[PDB]
Structures are given as C-alpha cells and as structure tokens.
RNA sequence: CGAAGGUGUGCUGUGAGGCAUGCUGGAGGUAUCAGAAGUGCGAAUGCUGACAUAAGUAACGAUAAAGCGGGUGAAAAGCCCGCUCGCCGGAAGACCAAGGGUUCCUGUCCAACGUUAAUCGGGGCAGGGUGAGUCGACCCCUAAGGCGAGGCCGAAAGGCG
RNA sequence: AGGACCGAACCGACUAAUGUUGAAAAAUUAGCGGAUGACUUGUGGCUGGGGGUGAAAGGCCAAUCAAACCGGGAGAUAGCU
RNA sequence: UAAGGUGAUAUGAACCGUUAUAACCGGCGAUUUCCGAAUGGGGAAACCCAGUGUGUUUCGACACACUAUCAUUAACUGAAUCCAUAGGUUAAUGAGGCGAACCGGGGGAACUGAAACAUCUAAGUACCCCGAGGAAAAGAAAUCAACCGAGAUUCCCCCAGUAGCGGCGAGCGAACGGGGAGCAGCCCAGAGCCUGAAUCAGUGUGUGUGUUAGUGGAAGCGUCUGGAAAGGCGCGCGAUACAGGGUGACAGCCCCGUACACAAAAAUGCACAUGCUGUGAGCUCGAUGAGUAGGGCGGGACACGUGGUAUCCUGUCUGAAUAUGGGGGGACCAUCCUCCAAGGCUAAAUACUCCUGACUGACCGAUAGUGAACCAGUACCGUGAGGGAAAGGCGAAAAGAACCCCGGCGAGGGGAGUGAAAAAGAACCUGAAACCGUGUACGUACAAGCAGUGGGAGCACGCUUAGGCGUGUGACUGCGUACC
C-alpha cells in the first residue's frame, strides 16, 4: 500500500542536506554531534 | 649503522644450517636479507596455462632476519664482533677483536 | 628428555576438599610461611552466544496454462532453434517523468544469489557503450514562500519589515 | 443556468464475502455510491507540543497522542517487589 | 644521517644507485585545484551566474586581478540646498573561521529532603546562551578589627558543626583569626629638586645548558638433546651497562638499545653578563574627587526566611557636609576607633587538555576493556533528532597447494609435495558443555504414576589373584506425590 515516507532526494536534501542543516544553528549542531559520534556521512542525499 | 654488508661472507645465527656460509644477495625493508646457498623454498605456483604455464614448481630463495646474521671471521669457522669505522664514505671493519681494549 | 590449562579412572577424609594415575598439550609453573580481597551461581516476567524438540509437518506470493520435435549441456519440462497452441489486448500495450543507479549490449561463468532446475539472468566476472548550437535544464522575468540591508525587536538562539 | 436525475475517466466507504503466522502495517472480489461542487487534483510551500489542525471524535499531528518522538536532570523516589 | 632505495597490497619494465638531489629526517618557505570564513552576487558538499578596469581580434570572445559586511583613519565626490552633510567612491588597519579542556557574564528548573507541603532544602546544579584569555577572576581599604592591633587577593589544613539564620522545623551555616602554599604593589586629582641611578618587558649579540635531525659503548665458547634452543652441562667472562623490545622454545655476553659520554646549518626554552628602545632609583612640598553618598519607597547579593535588620549591588523619585566635616563598626543613639568613596590598573601560589615529555596501575584480554583491537559508528532501523551489530590470533618462515587423478578441461576429494605438523590447507592455535553419524553387549512385543532408594534371577564386560569390587543391561519386588 502507500507509505508515510515516499522516496524524494529533493525534499531530503531540503530538510536534512548538508548546507540546509549548516544554515541553521540547531542543524549545524546536529552536524557538530555527527562529528562527535563519528558518523562517516554528513549528507545522505549526495 | 652497519654490522654485515654484502661485499664479504656472513654466517647465520638463527635456526638455519650451521655448516654453511655466503654473501648477501639482496636486502628488504622488513629488516631481512637473502643469502647465497643457505636456504631454499619449494613454491608450487598457480599453473594457469594461458597466463603463466611455469613448468611445475619454482624452487625459490627466501629471506632471514637481519639481527641474527653476523660477519664470518674466516679464521676459526665462526661469527665475531669486529666493529665498523672508516674516515670517508662507507664505514668498513676495524677488527676490534684483533686489538687491545681500553 | 614434557610445565600449566582442560579432562578421564582409581584412592582418601564428617565436609568445602585433598591424593595417585591415564588422555590431550607444549608451553609455562612455583612447593611453603606471612600480608590483602575485585573471594563461593540455577532462578532477577535479567543480559549476550549455541543447539534439540516441535517436524519432512506449514509454505513456495490468487484463478493466463505454454506443448512437442530438434539443439546446447555431465545434466533441461523452464534456456537457443522449429512448428503449434493459449491468454491479455484502454493492458497483461506504446511514449514521457519522478525515483533509483553500470542495470544497456557480447563474451563467458555457474560456488553464492533468483527460498529450484538452471545451460537462463537486472546474479558472478570481464570487455564494449552514453556522438546535441536547435531536445528537458540554464537564459530573462518572477507567484506562494524563504532569506533580508540600511532600520527595528530580543540577554540570546531567533525574529519583524 | 443549476450545492440538479443516471453515469465513464476521476474519486471512495457503506453492506456482504475472502483474507487474518497474510501477498499485506489494512489488501482482495462483487455491489451500492461521490462526480461543476460547501468538489477534486498535479507541483512547491506554510501551521508544532498544552502548541497545531478539526462543519470538532480529545479524532488527526509520519503506526505512537487525556498529551507525540529523541536526548538529558536520571542509576530521581518506591515503609513495596 | 646514510647505501640501499623508487609508500603498501606488487610484481616487472623503467629509474637514482653506492660519487657532489638515492631513499629517510631536522630548520624555514614556498606551491596549495574546488567546496568551505569565503569576502562580487546566488546556492546545492564539492555547483551556478555577474561586474569593474585594460588589452587583443575574422573587433565570431578571450582572461588577467580586482569587487563583501561592520567600526575607525585619510582622499575625492555628493541629495533635498548654496556652503554643507546623509548618500557615493578609493586606499589602509581591526574583526570574521578553526582548535582539547578550563574560565567571566546571561537565561534558569524539576526531582530530592522536610517520612506530608508552598517558605526552607535541592541549586545558581541540569541544560541552553553570550564572550574571552593562556589562564579567566580577585587586590593592597570611605576594608578588617576592638583600644590589641591587622594592612591585598587566591589556594590548602583549620577556626566550626561554634556564631548567625531557621515553619524555634527539616536543616543551611559563617566571620574574627591561627598554621601553611605563595609574597610587587602603584598612579591620576600636580609641581619642583635628584638623574637618568632601582625594576620589568621587548629587541641586536655573547656565555652556560637543554629541546628539535644523532653514533659510540664490556663479555659466550664448546658439547649434548631437538627438525629447530635465548635450554641442560661444563664452566668462562663482563656489569656505573642483568631495562623494555626484537631475533625460530627461557639472551647479562646476537640486534635496536642501557649505564657512561659528546655535537651543531637553522629554529628555540631556561639561567649568567651586556648594548639599545620604552618605563624610571632617591628627596620635598601642595592637594584629597558631588547627580552620587545620603533620604523615602522596592528588589538583588549576604550562611542569614520579614524580623527589632546593619552592609554592599540596584529599580525609581529625590539629592549632601567641611573639622563643634563625612563613611563604617550587623537595629538605633552617643562616645570612640578606623577608613575618606564619588578616578584607573595588577603579580601567580589557583583551573585544564586535543598536544609535548617523564613516571605508573594488587589493569583487561575478542561477550573482557570503550558499542567499537577486525576498512565500526561500517552493515542495519527511523521522515528525523537519535538509535546500532557480526567479526582477532596457520607457520619460525609463504615455503599458500604443483604433480598424479575421479569429475563437467568442475565444485568436492584421495594420494602426493612443503613443513615440526596442513588429523596447521588460509573454512588454518589448542579446544570442555550443547549437537549428530559409526560399533558391541542387554532387556525386548499382557500389562498403567516424579522413573529414584533398598532387596535382586538371567546375560554381557572389566578388575582382583582372587578372599561380597566396579561397569553395561535387567525380570520381579520392600519404600516413595518432584524443584525455585
């Protein structure tokens, strides 16, 4: 049937994309916490 | 500093054959050397007729650890501590085992 | 020239234990006496790993159904070729897009994958392939909305206009 | 002309049946029905936690919700287990 | 410094060799695509599109070097509007982003305790924000005492579970001051005399010694066992060197090393001496801060709760005195002592880590210790913040699987080679419990409960020199409702 998440790299890159996160205090802090946990990707749209 | 070099005969202080001596053929970055007539290894090798076709086994040379290879004394059938000192370029033997200690 | 660990069989004490002797191992061990606890396992609707039974029992993804002859192969009813049949035919067809990402094609390979057979394959592994002035994007303007100077509000993150 | 009678595309929940360790995170088969509207829809936005949204059920708010989800104070507290 | 190197899986060709760029390293100093402060503007993780000025040419499009924002400095320009200035332009400096932990300021709980709750406790914690230095912060008095006097602050042991506060509850909890660590104080309100005299930093050098590239440094042989010894033995010898580590089973005498000892292109710490620049040793006499202290009203910080509540910040109104003046001394008053505001600054003894170095653990060892020793914050879950594994160790050495063959010119495998061994074949140390095949002996096709414990025929097995001992199996029968 239908899913609550449908595949879209346009809206993923708009909410969770690297520059989109960096352009906000809290998203830039999510990225700072990615670097604290050591996550190998900082974007999953590119 | 050097303690054996490749220009004169060496003897092996490891588990290897104690009745053989030879010169160094080649040196490795692993702290190892290849020596003439001491040791050989069988080496089967992949036949692969359209890419190799080696005619069976290779029977090749094998390296040994450089700390327990020593210079042959050519006098009493054994290894000796001799010292390496020279005024210009490559340091060669000064044979401290044939001189008095101070 | 066989020390610990693990472990069998016998011996021995009221008992936690202690002792002799075989198998395995090939590296480590330490007799005694004095100091010191990170010192006694089956349970916590406890945490993590392994395996039996349930049981060859369930299922193989609806209700279009491929057949025979020949081939290729060690092997084929499913692959290649021939003849023939069947169903869908507003789809079970044709073109465009999002989203995905080497999937295309020939050339081979058959361990694993497609909960099978597999010679097929979007699978393994190579090699080849993506030729634009005009096509879709870009151009130039800009809606909803976002950002936002000078300016304002706010410790501030942030926000108004 | 039409908050009009029937009706494709389009939409969609009411009855019945099948499904229910499924094909299945809600479908399937048949029918009745919504179809110029107080409608529906392609594409991109905007509305947030006692706040949103609601012709208003405390329903819906990414399966969760008399108060969502994650991370912290938190190994809080339990005359009990 | 040095002869073997050109990173590794990785070999070979080619290439430096060994001789004045071989590789490797120390100093400083270039080179540094695009994203990214990102600085023309736009924006999207590595992309997009302009302008200013100059030149070139089929004047079909090339391609330098430059253009941000804010604050300040200068120069030109300039609107209403003359002059001017907002505005515009050009050059320069400062900031911007990053980096572990510490640190000043701002926002500010609930839980918890009060065996119950609001004040009080908890807590200026938790978490978030701003900002900044090598430390941040504090300071030498309108302070603190008590007639004795102190004479900066911070950090430590104490003072003290005392004073004080306190639903006179629960409990919060000092100061004075001692012992100690650690000791730098000054200027402006203003001038001269003295002479550049004390002290500190910076900078050109010098000396002494470390740091960043180092190389020297004493002794062990034989014999046996073993495939191999760093072992046994004979004993021998060194030790200011018996520390790690490495090398084929235990290395004081094999290697990198240690004790012990040096050497210097450039860069640089500590300390001794010196030049220079800046600061200026000593003497003496003036002079003592008025929109802010008080005062009414209200908060904040005080150990300190609304009380009889001082003090210091601070909101608001209001605003002062001169020596028979003023602040304070925890109500208020006097007396008295002490300070005299209304100006500015301050040693590190203290705090801490990504990093640099020395030392250490009665630390763990693949479920340990971090979730993570392993191409792990990977695979994988969610729209997302955020959750989150499996998986190490053949061997001394790659010697790593030829050759002989069955098969599909297979998988899988025997023989065989290597090797100590692959009954070590990379799926590889040695491996108990769980699991499943292989073989032998017994009971074995008419009788019903925790399957054990006693008594026990037959059969089969092992010990014993055997003299009532075990093992396997077991007819039948006395006793018998488990365990947390």
PDB file of N, CA, C and O (backbone and C1' of nucleotides) in Angstrom, chain E residues 298-334:
ATOM      1  P     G E 298       8.752  49.605  50.970  1.00  0.00           P
ATOM      2  O5'   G E 298       9.357  48.977  49.634  1.00  0.00           O
ATOM      3  C5'   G E 298       8.526  48.604  48.544  1.00  0.00           C
ATOM      4  C4'   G E 298       9.319  48.120  47.328  1.00  0.00           C
ATOM      5  C3'   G E 298      10.170  46.873  47.535  1.00  0.00           C
ATOM      6  O3'   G E 298       9.440  45.670  47.663  1.00  0.00           O
ATOM      7  C1'   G E 298      11.300  48.470  46.236  1.00  0.00           C
ATOM      8  P     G E 299      10.135  44.319  48.120  1.00  0.00           P
ATOM      9  O5'   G E 299      10.887  43.844  46.819  1.00  0.00           O
ATOM     10  C5'   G E 299      12.039  43.055  46.901  1.00  0.00           C
ATOM     11  C4'   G E 299      12.678  42.962  45.525  1.00  0.00           C
ATOM     12  C3'   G E 299      13.967  42.165  45.576  1.00  0.00           C
ATOM     13  O3'   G E 299      13.794  40.769  45.403  1.00  0.00           O
ATOM     14  C1'   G E 299      14.352  44.317  44.691  1.00  0.00           C
ATOM     15  P     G E 300      14.829  39.732  46.011  1.00  0.00           P
ATOM     16  O5'   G E 300      16.174  40.095  45.313  1.00  0.00           O
ATOM     17  C5'   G E 300      16.423  39.782  43.952  1.00  0.00           C
ATOM     18  C4'   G E 300      17.818  40.186  43.572  1.00  0.00           C
ATOM     19  C3'   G E 300      18.825  39.464  44.444  1.00  0.00           C
ATOM     20  O3'   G E 300      19.026  38.128  44.031  1.00  0.00           O
ATOM     21  C1'   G E 300      19.326  41.748  44.288  1.00  0.00           C
ATOM     22  P     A E 301      19.442  37.014  45.072  1.00  0.00           P
ATOM     23  O5'   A E 301      20.924  37.329  45.464  1.00  0.00           O
ATOM     24  C5'   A E 301      21.948  37.317  44.503  1.00  0.00           C
ATOM     25  C4'   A E 301      23.182  37.970  45.080  1.00  0.00           C
ATOM     26  C3'   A E 301      23.726  37.280  46.330  1.00  0.00           C
ATOM     27  O3'   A E 301      24.480  36.094  46.111  1.00  0.00           O
ATOM     28  C1'   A E 301      23.667  39.635  46.617  1.00  0.00           C
ATOM     29  P     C E 302      24.656  35.063  47.310  1.00  0.00           P
ATOM     30  O5'   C E 302      25.311  35.931  48.462  1.00  0.00           O
ATOM     31  C5'   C E 302      25.034  35.689  49.824  1.00  0.00           C
ATOM     32  C4'   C E 302      25.619  36.805  50.669  1.00  0.00           C
ATOM     33  C3'   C E 302      25.897  36.335  52.092  1.00  0.00           C
ATOM     34  O3'   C E 302      27.126  35.659  52.147  1.00  0.00           O
ATOM     35  C1'   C E 302      24.773  38.436  52.067  1.00  0.00           C
ATOM     36  P     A E 303      27.642  34.972  53.476  1.00  0.00           P
ATOM     37  O5'   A E 303      26.616  33.819  53.775  1.00  0.00           O
ATOM     38  C5'   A E 303      26.478  32.701  52.918  1.00  0.00           C
ATOM     39  C4'   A E 303      25.583  31.642  53.548  1.00  0.00           C
ATOM     40  C3'   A E 303      24.194  32.149  53.868  1.00  0.00           C
ATOM     41  O3'   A E 303      23.275  31.732  52.883  1.00  0.00           O
ATOM     42  C1'   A E 303      25.295  31.331  55.834  1.00  0.00           C
ATOM     43  P     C E 304      22.046  32.612  52.441  1.00  0.00           P
ATOM     44  O5'   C E 304      21.426  33.293  53.735  1.00  0.00           O
ATOM     45  C5'   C E 304      20.448  32.649  54.517  1.00  0.00           C
ATOM     46  C4'   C E 304      20.057  33.485  55.743  1.00  0.00           C
ATOM     47  C3'   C E 304      19.506  34.870  55.396  1.00  0.00           C
ATOM     48  O3'   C E 304      18.129  34.793  55.181  1.00  0.00           O
ATOM     49  C1'   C E 304      21.111  34.971  57.168  1.00  0.00           C
ATOM     50  P     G E 305      17.254  36.068  54.874  1.00  0.00           P
ATOM     51  O5'   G E 305      15.873  35.367  54.748  1.00  0.00           O
ATOM     52  C5'   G E 305      14.831  35.909  53.990  1.00  0.00           C
ATOM     53  C4'   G E 305      13.520  35.356  54.499  1.00  0.00           C
ATOM     54  C3'   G E 305      13.260  35.750  55.961  1.00  0.00           C
ATOM     55  O3'   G E 305      11.959  36.204  56.237  1.00  0.00           O
ATOM     56  C1'   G E 305      13.421  33.393  55.728  1.00  0.00           C
ATOM     57  P     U E 306      10.615  35.502  55.806  1.00  0.00           P
ATOM     58  O5'   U E 306       9.612  36.499  56.512  1.00  0.00           O
ATOM     59  C5'   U E 306       9.621  36.691  57.925  1.00  0.00           C
ATOM     60  C4'   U E 306       9.585  38.182  58.276  1.00  0.00           C
ATOM     61  C3'   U E 306       8.402  38.918  57.640  1.00  0.00           C
ATOM     62  O3'   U E 306       7.824  39.903  58.486  1.00  0.00           O
ATOM     63  C1'   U E 306      10.389  39.973  57.119  1.00  0.00           C
ATOM     64  P     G E 307       7.074  39.515  59.818  1.00  0.00           P
ATOM     65  O5'   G E 307       8.214  39.461  60.902  1.00  0.00           O
ATOM     66  C5'   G E 307       8.813  40.670  61.332  1.00  0.00           C
ATOM     67  C4'   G E 307      10.076  40.373  62.105  1.00  0.00           C
ATOM     68  C3'   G E 307      10.679  41.660  62.654  1.00  0.00           C
ATOM     69  O3'   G E 307      10.029  42.155  63.810  1.00  0.00           O
ATOM     70  C1'   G E 307      12.310  40.243  61.690  1.00  0.00           C
ATOM     71  P     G E 308       9.727  43.706  64.006  1.00  0.00           P
ATOM     72  O5'   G E 308      11.117  44.359  64.253  1.00  0.00           O
ATOM     73  C5'   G E 308      11.219  45.766  64.423  1.00  0.00           C
ATOM     74  C4'   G E 308      12.572  46.134  64.978  1.00  0.00           C
ATOM     75  C3'   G E 308      13.717  45.661  64.104  1.00  0.00           C
ATOM     76  O3'   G E 308      14.100  46.683  63.206  1.00  0.00           O
ATOM     77  C1'   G E 308      13.965  44.920  66.369  1.00  0.00           C
ATOM     78  P     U E 309      13.836  46.620  61.641  1.00  0.00           P
ATOM     79  O5'   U E 309      15.223  46.132  61.093  1.00  0.00           O
ATOM     80  C5'   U E 309      16.363  46.939  61.267  1.00  0.00           C
ATOM     81  C4'   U E 309      17.549  46.388  60.483  1.00  0.00           C
ATOM     82  C3'   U E 309      17.216  46.106  59.016  1.00  0.00           C
ATOM     83  O3'   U E 309      18.317  46.328  58.171  1.00  0.00           O
ATOM     84  C1'   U E 309      17.736  44.081  60.212  1.00  0.00           C
ATOM     85  P     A E 310      18.636  47.762  57.569  1.00  0.00           P
ATOM     86  O5'   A E 310      20.136  47.999  57.952  1.00  0.00           O
ATOM     87  C5'   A E 310      20.506  48.771  59.092  1.00  0.00           C
ATOM     88  C4'   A E 310      21.940  48.509  59.487  1.00  0.00           C
ATOM     89  C3'   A E 310      22.917  48.610  58.331  1.00  0.00           C
ATOM     90  O3'   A E 310      23.318  49.937  58.048  1.00  0.00           O
ATOM     91  C1'   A E 310      23.281  46.624  59.554  1.00  0.00           C
ATOM     92  P     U E 311      23.591  50.377  56.554  1.00  0.00           P
ATOM     93  O5'   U E 311      24.661  49.382  55.975  1.00  0.00           O
ATOM     94  C5'   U E 311      25.975  49.370  56.443  1.00  0.00           C
ATOM     95  C4'   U E 311      26.770  48.282  55.729  1.00  0.00           C
ATOM     96  C3'   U E 311      26.840  48.541  54.224  1.00  0.00           C
ATOM     97  O3'   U E 311      27.891  49.423  53.913  1.00  0.00           O
ATOM     98  C1'   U E 311      26.355  46.226  54.702  1.00  0.00           C
ATOM     99  P     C E 312      27.818  50.403  52.664  1.00  0.00           P
ATOM    100  O5'   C E 312      27.865  49.419  51.414  1.00  0.00           O
ATOM    101  C5'   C E 312      29.071  48.820  50.999  1.00  0.00           C
ATOM    102  C4'   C E 312      28.831  47.683  50.007  1.00  0.00           C
ATOM    103  C3'   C E 312      28.156  48.099  48.707  1.00  0.00           C
ATOM    104  O3'   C E 312      29.024  48.714  47.796  1.00  0.00           O
ATOM    105  C1'   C E 312      27.280  46.073  49.540  1.00  0.00           C
ATOM    106  P     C E 313      28.491  49.475  46.531  1.00  0.00           P
ATOM    107  O5'   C E 313      27.883  48.338  45.617  1.00  0.00           O
ATOM    108  C5'   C E 313      27.055  48.636  44.518  1.00  0.00           C
ATOM    109  C4'   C E 313      26.658  47.335  43.828  1.00  0.00           C
ATOM    110  C3'   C E 313      25.584  47.542  42.768  1.00  0.00           C
ATOM    111  O3'   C E 313      26.081  47.619  41.443  1.00  0.00           O
ATOM    112  C1'   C E 313      24.882  45.982  44.441  1.00  0.00           C
ATOM    113  P     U E 314      25.347  48.462  40.314  1.00  0.00           P
ATOM    114  O5'   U E 314      23.801  48.323  40.569  1.00  0.00           O
ATOM    115  C5'   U E 314      23.019  47.304  39.976  1.00  0.00           C
ATOM    116  C4'   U E 314      21.569  47.457  40.379  1.00  0.00           C
ATOM    117  C3'   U E 314      20.976  48.814  39.992  1.00  0.00           C
ATOM    118  O3'   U E 314      20.516  48.754  38.645  1.00  0.00           O
ATOM    119  C1'   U E 314      20.372  48.138  42.246  1.00  0.00           C
ATOM    120  P     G E 315      19.931  49.998  37.850  1.00  0.00           P
ATOM    121  O5'   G E 315      18.423  50.069  38.292  1.00  0.00           O
ATOM    122  C5'   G E 315      17.451  49.282  37.633  1.00  0.00           C
ATOM    123  C4'   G E 315      16.071  49.580  38.166  1.00  0.00           C
ATOM    124  C3'   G E 315      15.667  51.057  38.132  1.00  0.00           C
ATOM    125  O3'   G E 315      15.247  51.503  36.849  1.00  0.00           O
ATOM    126  C1'   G E 315      14.982  49.984  40.144  1.00  0.00           C
ATOM    127  P     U E 316      15.259  53.052  36.487  1.00  0.00           P
ATOM    128  O5'   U E 316      14.400  53.803  37.585  1.00  0.00           O
ATOM    129  C5'   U E 316      13.010  53.911  37.464  1.00  0.00           C
ATOM    130  C4'   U E 316      12.422  54.643  38.673  1.00  0.00           C
ATOM    131  C3'   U E 316      12.979  56.034  38.919  1.00  0.00           C
ATOM    132  O3'   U E 316      12.509  57.022  38.018  1.00  0.00           O
ATOM    133  C1'   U E 316      12.640  54.853  40.971  1.00  0.00           C
ATOM    134  P     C E 317      13.198  58.441  37.920  1.00  0.00           P
ATOM    135  O5'   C E 317      12.746  59.281  39.191  1.00  0.00           O
ATOM    136  C5'   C E 317      11.436  59.756  39.312  1.00  0.00           C
ATOM    137  C4'   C E 317      11.144  60.153  40.760  1.00  0.00           C
ATOM    138  C3'   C E 317      11.942  61.342  41.256  1.00  0.00           C
ATOM    139  O3'   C E 317      11.465  62.608  40.836  1.00  0.00           O
ATOM    140  C1'   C E 317      11.904  59.600  42.885  1.00  0.00           C
ATOM    141  P     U E 318      12.450  63.817  40.642  1.00  0.00           P
ATOM    142  O5'   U E 318      13.216  63.952  42.028  1.00  0.00           O
ATOM    143  C5'   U E 318      12.578  64.539  43.154  1.00  0.00           C
ATOM    144  C4'   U E 318      13.396  64.376  44.435  1.00  0.00           C
ATOM    145  C3'   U E 318      14.743  65.053  44.431  1.00  0.00           C
ATOM    146  O3'   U E 318      14.723  66.447  44.676  1.00  0.00           O
ATOM    147  C1'   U E 318      14.889  62.893  45.408  1.00  0.00           C
ATOM    148  P     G E 319      15.911  67.357  44.205  1.00  0.00           P
ATOM    149  O5'   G E 319      17.160  66.872  45.052  1.00  0.00           O
ATOM    150  C5'   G E 319      17.268  67.156  46.446  1.00  0.00           C
ATOM    151  C4'   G E 319      18.494  66.499  47.070  1.00  0.00           C
ATOM    152  C3'   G E 319      19.792  67.151  46.669  1.00  0.00           C
ATOM    153  O3'   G E 319      20.026  68.309  47.455  1.00  0.00           O
ATOM    154  C1'   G E 319      19.913  64.781  46.480  1.00  0.00           C
ATOM    155  P     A E 320      21.297  69.212  47.301  1.00  0.00           P
ATOM    156  O5'   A E 320      22.282  68.545  48.358  1.00  0.00           O
ATOM    157  C5'   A E 320      21.977  68.616  49.752  1.00  0.00           C
ATOM    158  C4'   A E 320      23.044  67.954  50.626  1.00  0.00           C
ATOM    159  C3'   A E 320      24.324  68.736  50.737  1.00  0.00           C
ATOM    160  O3'   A E 320      24.166  69.915  51.514  1.00  0.00           O
ATOM    161  C1'   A E 320      24.663  66.365  50.791  1.00  0.00           C
ATOM    162  P     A E 321      25.300  70.985  51.653  1.00  0.00           P
ATOM    163  O5'   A E 321      26.277  70.408  52.756  1.00  0.00           O
ATOM    164  C5'   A E 321      25.969  70.404  54.134  1.00  0.00           C
ATOM    165  C4'   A E 321      27.096  69.763  54.919  1.00  0.00           C
ATOM    166  C3'   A E 321      28.380  70.533  54.800  1.00  0.00           C
ATOM    167  O3'   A E 321      28.364  71.706  55.589  1.00  0.00           O
ATOM    168  C1'   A E 321      28.756  68.215  54.573  1.00  0.00           C
ATOM    169  P     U E 322      29.245  72.958  55.233  1.00  0.00           P
ATOM    170  O5'   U E 322      30.670  72.589  55.798  1.00  0.00           O
ATOM    171  C5'   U E 322      30.872  72.352  57.188  1.00  0.00           C
ATOM    172  C4'   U E 322      32.218  71.702  57.455  1.00  0.00           C
ATOM    173  C3'   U E 322      33.402  72.626  57.242  1.00  0.00           C
ATOM    174  O3'   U E 322      34.260  72.449  58.348  1.00  0.00           O
ATOM    175  C1'   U E 322      33.571  70.613  55.930  1.00  0.00           C
ATOM    176  P     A E 323      35.013  73.642  59.047  1.00  0.00           P
ATOM    177  O5'   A E 323      35.630  72.850  60.277  1.00  0.00           O
ATOM    178  C5'   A E 323      34.803  72.329  61.302  1.00  0.00           C
ATOM    179  C4'   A E 323      35.472  71.202  62.116  1.00  0.00           C
ATOM    180  C3'   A E 323      36.879  71.511  62.573  1.00  0.00           C
ATOM    181  O3'   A E 323      37.196  70.837  63.791  1.00  0.00           O
ATOM    182  C1'   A E 323      36.859  69.679  61.078  1.00  0.00           C
ATOM    183  P     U E 324      36.938  71.495  65.214  1.00  0.00           P
ATOM    184  O5'   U E 324      35.382  71.464  65.416  1.00  0.00           O
ATOM    185  C5'   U E 324      34.724  70.231  65.663  1.00  0.00           C
ATOM    186  C4'   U E 324      33.243  70.440  65.894  1.00  0.00           C
ATOM    187  C3'   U E 324      32.519  71.271  64.837  1.00  0.00           C
ATOM    188  O3'   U E 324      32.241  70.554  63.634  1.00  0.00           O
ATOM    189  C1'   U E 324      31.796  71.800  67.072  1.00  0.00           C
ATOM    190  P     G E 325      31.411  71.258  62.466  1.00  0.00           P
ATOM    191  O5'   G E 325      31.743  70.467  61.120  1.00  0.00           O
ATOM    192  C5'   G E 325      31.474  69.082  60.966  1.00  0.00           C
ATOM    193  C4'   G E 325      31.681  68.633  59.512  1.00  0.00           C
ATOM    194  C3'   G E 325      31.236  67.190  59.299  1.00  0.00           C
ATOM    195  O3'   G E 325      29.849  67.057  59.229  1.00  0.00           O
ATOM    196  C1'   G E 325      33.268  67.572  58.213  1.00  0.00           C
ATOM    197  P     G E 326      29.146  65.684  59.573  1.00  0.00           P
ATOM    198  O5'   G E 326      29.661  64.645  58.500  1.00  0.00           O
ATOM    199  C5'   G E 326      29.220  64.711  57.154  1.00  0.00           C
ATOM    200  C4'   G E 326      29.906  63.647  56.313  1.00  0.00           C
ATOM    201  C3'   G E 326      29.699  62.205  56.793  1.00  0.00           C
ATOM    202  O3'   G E 326      28.411  61.723  56.525  1.00  0.00           O
ATOM    203  C1'   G E 326      31.906  62.569  56.156  1.00  0.00           C
ATOM    204  P     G E 327      27.877  60.349  57.121  1.00  0.00           P
ATOM    205  O5'   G E 327      28.751  59.188  56.518  1.00  0.00           O
ATOM    206  C5'   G E 327      28.598  58.758  55.174  1.00  0.00           C
ATOM    207  C4'   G E 327      29.515  57.580  54.892  1.00  0.00           C
ATOM    208  C3'   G E 327      29.275  56.397  55.823  1.00  0.00           C
ATOM    209  O3'   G E 327      28.165  55.627  55.476  1.00  0.00           O
ATOM    210  C1'   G E 327      31.539  56.772  55.582  1.00  0.00           C
ATOM    211  P     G E 328      27.344  54.891  56.594  1.00  0.00           P
ATOM    212  O5'   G E 328      28.300  53.786  57.222  1.00  0.00           O
ATOM    213  C5'   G E 328      28.720  52.674  56.440  1.00  0.00           C
ATOM    214  C4'   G E 328      29.832  51.903  57.138  1.00  0.00           C
ATOM    215  C3'   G E 328      29.479  51.290  58.493  1.00  0.00           C
ATOM    216  O3'   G E 328      28.737  50.091  58.414  1.00  0.00           O
ATOM    217  C1'   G E 328      31.569  52.338  58.591  1.00  0.00           C
ATOM    218  P     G E 329      28.043  49.467  59.705  1.00  0.00           P
ATOM    219  O5'   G E 329      29.176  48.993  60.678  1.00  0.00           O
ATOM    220  C5'   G E 329      29.998  47.884  60.424  1.00  0.00           C
ATOM    221  C4'   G E 329      31.044  47.799  61.516  1.00  0.00           C
ATOM    222  C3'   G E 329      30.449  47.440  62.872  1.00  0.00           C
ATOM    223  O3'   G E 329      30.334  46.031  63.057  1.00  0.00           O
ATOM    224  C1'   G E 329      31.881  49.326  63.067  1.00  0.00           C
ATOM    225  P     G E 330      29.313  45.436  64.101  1.00  0.00           P
ATOM    226  O5'   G E 330      28.004  45.248  63.254  1.00  0.00           O
ATOM    227  C5'   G E 330      27.162  46.343  62.933  1.00  0.00           C
ATOM    228  C4'   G E 330      25.771  45.857  62.613  1.00  0.00           C
ATOM    229  C3'   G E 330      25.254  44.894  63.696  1.00  0.00           C
ATOM    230  O3'   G E 330      23.927  45.169  64.035  1.00  0.00           O
ATOM    231  C1'   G E 330      25.262  43.893  61.514  1.00  0.00           C
ATOM    232  P     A E 331      23.574  46.355  65.039  1.00  0.00           P
ATOM    233  O5'   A E 331      22.065  46.639  64.710  1.00  0.00           O
ATOM    234  C5'   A E 331      21.612  46.763  63.368  1.00  0.00           C
ATOM    235  C4'   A E 331      20.220  47.347  63.334  1.00  0.00           C
ATOM    236  C3'   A E 331      20.196  48.867  63.521  1.00  0.00           C
ATOM    237  O3'   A E 331      20.298  49.586  62.304  1.00  0.00           O
ATOM    238  C1'   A E 331      18.663  47.806  64.966  1.00  0.00           C
ATOM    239  P     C E 332      20.957  51.023  62.251  1.00  0.00           P
ATOM    240  O5'   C E 332      20.352  51.830  63.472  1.00  0.00           O
ATOM    241  C5'   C E 332      19.179  52.586  63.367  1.00  0.00           C
ATOM    242  C4'   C E 332      18.888  53.269  64.702  1.00  0.00           C
ATOM    243  C3'   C E 332      20.033  54.107  65.229  1.00  0.00           C
ATOM    244  O3'   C E 332      20.198  55.342  64.553  1.00  0.00           O
ATOM    245  C1'   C E 332      19.045  52.873  66.982  1.00  0.00           C
ATOM    246  P     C E 333      21.549  56.122  64.608  1.00  0.00           P
ATOM    247  O5'   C E 333      21.639  56.597  66.104  1.00  0.00           O
ATOM    248  C5'   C E 333      20.845  57.648  66.603  1.00  0.00           C
ATOM    249  C4'   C E 333      21.175  57.889  68.066  1.00  0.00           C
ATOM    250  C3'   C E 333      22.632  58.200  68.229  1.00  0.00           C
ATOM    251  O3'   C E 333      22.967  59.462  67.689  1.00  0.00           O
ATOM    252  C1'   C E 333      21.912  56.765  69.940  1.00  0.00           C
ATOM    253  P     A E 334      24.395  59.764  67.140  1.00  0.00           P
ATOM    254  O5'   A E 334      25.289  59.986  68.441  1.00  0.00           O
ATOM    255  C5'   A E 334      24.994  61.021  69.379  1.00  0.00           C
ATOM    256  C4'   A E 334      25.568  60.712  70.768  1.00  0.00           C
ATOM    257  C3'   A E 334      27.070  60.643  70.838  1.00  0.00           C
ATOM    258  O3'   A E 334      27.629  61.929  71.000  1.00  0.00           O
ATOM    259  C1'   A E 334      26.125  58.782  71.945  1.00  0.00           C
TER     260        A E 334
END
